[PDB]
Design a protein around this ligand. Structure first.
Ligand SMILES: COc1cc2cc(c1OC)OC[C@@H](CO)OC/C=C/[C@H](O)[C@@H](C)OC(=O)[C@@H]1CCCCN1C(=O)[C@H]2C1CCCCC1
Length: 128
């Protein structure tokens, strides 16, 4: 499936090169610019435990998911991964627990030491 394809072909976009955030571009975006820290960012996404026990999607709430890049609001893996994307890109991320919810987890929704998978579409981003 898509997660395994990321393991196999995904680029390691971590600074430590620890495979903690792996990325495959699934549909290329438009123009050169990528978001900067502080930018207000608009996305659609589908996320699941890589074990498929829990799923989530912006679509379930009927509207884009909006957050400020680099600004405390999402797991580390998203701050890292969404920063690499272009307006209109869709990407897959596979995420080790250190870059998501760690040994602590976020019980009962997210277990300890959980690996996460997302599909993300960057819809837009605007400066603060
Ligand atoms: C741990 O708590 C949650 C995790 C996840 C989604 C959650 C959530 O409950 C707050 O609810 C959906 C809405 C609130 O209706 O919240 C969206 C973004 C929330 C925040 O940005 C944080 C908590 O989420 C994240 O950083 C990441 C990346 C952005 C999208 C949501 N994501 C998640 O980890 C998902 C999670 C749900 C279970 C399957 C794996 C993804």
């Amino acid at each position: 499936g898509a997660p395994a394809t990321v393991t196999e072909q995904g680029e390691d976009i971590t600074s430590k090169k620890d495979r903690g955030v792996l990325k495959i571009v699934k549909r290329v975006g438009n123009g050169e610019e990528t978001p900067m820290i502080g930018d207000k960012v608009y996305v659609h996404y589908k996320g699941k435990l890589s074990n498929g026990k829990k799923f989530d999607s912006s679509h379930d709430r009927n509207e884009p998911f909006v957050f400020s890049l680099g600004k405390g609001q999402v797991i580390k893996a998203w701050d890292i991964g969404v920063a690499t994307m272009k307006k209109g890109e869709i990407a897959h991320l596979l995420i080790k627990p250190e870059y998501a919810y760690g040994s602590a987890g976020s019980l009962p929704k997210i277990p300890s030491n959980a690996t996460l998978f997302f599909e993300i579409e960057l819809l837009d981003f605007k400066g603060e």
